[PDB]
Amino acid sequence: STAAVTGQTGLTITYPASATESAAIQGTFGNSAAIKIKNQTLTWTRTPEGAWSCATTVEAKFKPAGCAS
Amino acid sequence: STAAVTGQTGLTITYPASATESAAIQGTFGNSAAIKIKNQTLTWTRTPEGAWSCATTVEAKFKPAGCAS
Amino acid sequence: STAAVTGQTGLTITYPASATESAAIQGTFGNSAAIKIKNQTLTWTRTPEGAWSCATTVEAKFKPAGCAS
Amino acid sequence: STAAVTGQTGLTITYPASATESAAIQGTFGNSAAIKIKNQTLTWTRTPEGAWSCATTVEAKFKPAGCAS
Amino acid sequence: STAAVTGQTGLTITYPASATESAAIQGTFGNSAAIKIKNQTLTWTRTPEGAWSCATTVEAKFKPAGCAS
Amino acid sequence: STAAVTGQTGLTITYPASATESAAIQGTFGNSAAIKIKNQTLTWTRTPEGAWSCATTVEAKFKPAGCAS
Amino acid sequence: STAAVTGQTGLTITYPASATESAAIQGTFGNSAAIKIKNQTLTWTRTPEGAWSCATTVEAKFKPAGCAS
Amino acid sequence: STAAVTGQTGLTITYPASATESAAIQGTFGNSAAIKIKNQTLTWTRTPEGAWSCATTVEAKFKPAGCAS
Amino acid sequence: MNMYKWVPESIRDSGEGQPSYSNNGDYAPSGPWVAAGIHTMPQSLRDSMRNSIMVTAQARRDVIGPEWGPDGRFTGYASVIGTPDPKPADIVNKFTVE
Amino acid sequence: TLIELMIVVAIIGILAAIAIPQYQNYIAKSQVSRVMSETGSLKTVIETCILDGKTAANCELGWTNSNLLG
Amino acid sequence: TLIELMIVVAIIGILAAIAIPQYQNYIAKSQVSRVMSETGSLKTVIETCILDGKTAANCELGWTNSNLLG
Amino acid sequence: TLIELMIVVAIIGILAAIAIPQYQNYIAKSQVSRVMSETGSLKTVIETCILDGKTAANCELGWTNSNLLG
Amino acid sequence: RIDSSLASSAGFVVAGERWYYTKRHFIIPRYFQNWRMRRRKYVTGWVMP
């Protein structure tokens, strides 16, 4: 719906309030997700200069090569 | 095949002629479908805002996680 | 040899036509069967939900554990 | 074509007849436009002092940053 | 293995050289296939409109629901 | 490449010589283009008064709203 | 269980390190296998081009149809 | 980072210094790329006149139609 | 104008070809056959046969419109597009000794 | 094995149930923004027509018919 | 476990008969739409050349080769 | 019956011996298409730097490190 | 790729379609294909001496 508040409980949006702080698109698994990864967190962060990078707390078996960090 | 008159008798398309009505893609089982779910229907409905959702009339044990609603 | 008509008269197949009927595979003894069980029968019935069960009209001593009902 | 009459029915222009009236260019969506904005209008109004400002009836989320008036 | 000629003698593909001819992929049984179907063929037909169709020369009871036409 | 002669065979440029003849840009599909439209052409013509318009010989289902004239 | 080292002594994996090396998945029978095939070796070899092919050292009468040498 | 020095080792930029030399952007496959196409290079070259084109050292079946030699 | 021509020295032994392991263990023309790895056969023989194929393909005809193999067994594939370009004719000039 | 194929169906179940974001926002904004340019393009002609004193019928417009009537 | 295996065979036949929509509409339309971008980019050159008064031979065209020949 | 189980055995061997469609060709092409797209977007910045007159060290590149080594 | 049987059977034992390069293996270059034969679309002109 909006960046400030979303219509899903499992999705959170971090909006930058200044030019010297980063933005994050964090999502936590749940509902129909696998029980092993039921409570893992997955976020997409953006540096203030305009660089997007991907990271997650899931196990290295489950990590894609594009987010192996 | 067009949306107004589809090429299959089991596929029905609800075309919205205005900005306030919703579109629906209804698919009814039959022919090669299982006898238990022979006369059930599966539909894809789209809100005017652009949000798609799935509904099905089959039993819960046959409903996938996507169309459990 | 189809479900509608079998190769022999001693085998009968009850094929359901709707989602609420049950299948039945009934076989009546004869020909080379014993005189005691000359006119007995054994039937395999299938519930519409997908459960198979066995029923037999032979005496208790001739009933195995498989169709002991 | 001309300010009095144009080659398109969906575009009309309000040409002032004196020094105390304003100039406005109005265009209505449709045809190949999105159905959600089928009958919405966007206007460029010119103040009699010579200042131009843009306004439209399209929803806020679809409004460009330049016509957020 | 190219479309013009492949590494297997039992497989051939008709490539469309124009816009008014259909594409076809033909597979002839053999080698370790059953002797009763040692010379029957299964083919995939692609209409020039972009639609895929299937047909085969095997008997009805051996024919699954996937290529009933 | 010039207006009179171009470096590509599939591009044709009609340069007007008087105030009554219309300018035109002609392009023919091929090479890596789809086989269905392998020999179709799309053209942009410019009227003597200076109006640019587009037309194409592809099927209706291949024409976007831009050139579905 | 990783490719370089696994948790079972009867399974070995040959992992290519360059574009010209071929993968191999070899399994040696034993433990619960037949005494006649107590030390036979079963391997899957993968060409660098991406083609999987089968080879085994068991007798011909024990080779299945797919891997019938 | 910059044309002279970038943030990735596999990326090289050929920045022209005179009006009679070309510009090139070359990328080398590796890390998360396929082992088969490892160490190969794809380059985007620019003539001093202003025309761009693509080339690559991968196999033909891996070459996209827009980068075919 | 254009004509299709062979590309000499641009063909490599890629290795996507499997020599056939013989089940019979001898030179029997028939019998079941296997798909064996390319590394089994010597590299010298591979180079010799590749060189023979290259000679057969390129050296047999440099600039001609030959025939493409109906079963794919061509020996150097080239083509001529449109009307083939004719030799400016061989200018025979005759002088007879009286 | 009935487990590999069943897992495949679940994977097919997962892939088909992907969340599709509202692409209507992107399309509608592009149409309005493009129309914004066309309507703003005729400003130059209107200004001088007003400043030169030409009448509404005497002001010639170089407007062309477009797919979007806006 | 005889009846167990042909469940996969039924599943394999079910999945193999999956409907394939006509992707030719999508690819060709994208190819046709791309051609317009290549074709429409030359409108500026042609319009300037005509208004400049130069002839066909004097109109320099910055056309780059396209794999679609459009 | 003994015949029934060998029939299951024949089914298992047949199913497991399905031919691999050589997915290396599919995967490799997709990665190549990805790499040229990123360096393709790099054409915009380099072109203007040449047309502006800036030096190699003075040209700003908004490049992001790629897992495929670019 | 097509077919790479252009080479003869030098060093092979000929047994029908089988080119036995060894006592235990043979090849069928009609199917044994591992060469990517290349063809281009050249341009050429005629010069008279």
Author numbering:
A (entry chain CQ), B (entry chain CR), C (entry chain CU), D (entry chain CN), E (entry chain CS), F (entry chain CO), ...: 79 to 147
I (entry chain b): 1 to 98
J (entry chain BT), K (entry chain BU), L (entry chain BV): 9 to 78
M (entry chain b): 147 to 195
Lines from the paper:
To investigate the recognition mechanism between AP205 and T4P, we employed single-particle cryo-EM to obtain a structure of the AP205/T4P complex. The two copies of Mat exhibit different conformations: One Mat (referred as outer Mat) extends further to elevate its apical domain away from the capsid shell while the other Mat (referred as inner Mat) is embedded deeper within the capsid and has a larger bending angle between the central and basal domains. Within the T4P-Mat complex, the apical domain of each Mat specifically plugs into the groove formed by three adjacent pilin subunits within the T4P (referred to as Pilins 1, 2). Notably, the C-terminal Ser147 of Pilins 1 and 2 are positioned near β3 and β7 of the Mat apical domain, respectively. Apparently, glycosylation at these two serines can prevent binding of AP205 Mat. It is likely that the substoichiometric glycosylation of pilins allows AP205 to bind to unglycosylated sites on the T4P. We also observed that the internal cleavage site of Pilin 3 at Ser79 is located at the binding interface for the apical domain. This cleavage allows Ser79 to move ~13 Å away from Gly78, allowing its interaction with β8 of the Mat. The Mat of AP205 has evolved to adapt to such a post-translational cleavage at the phage-pilus binding interface and may not be compatible with an uncleaved pilin anymore.
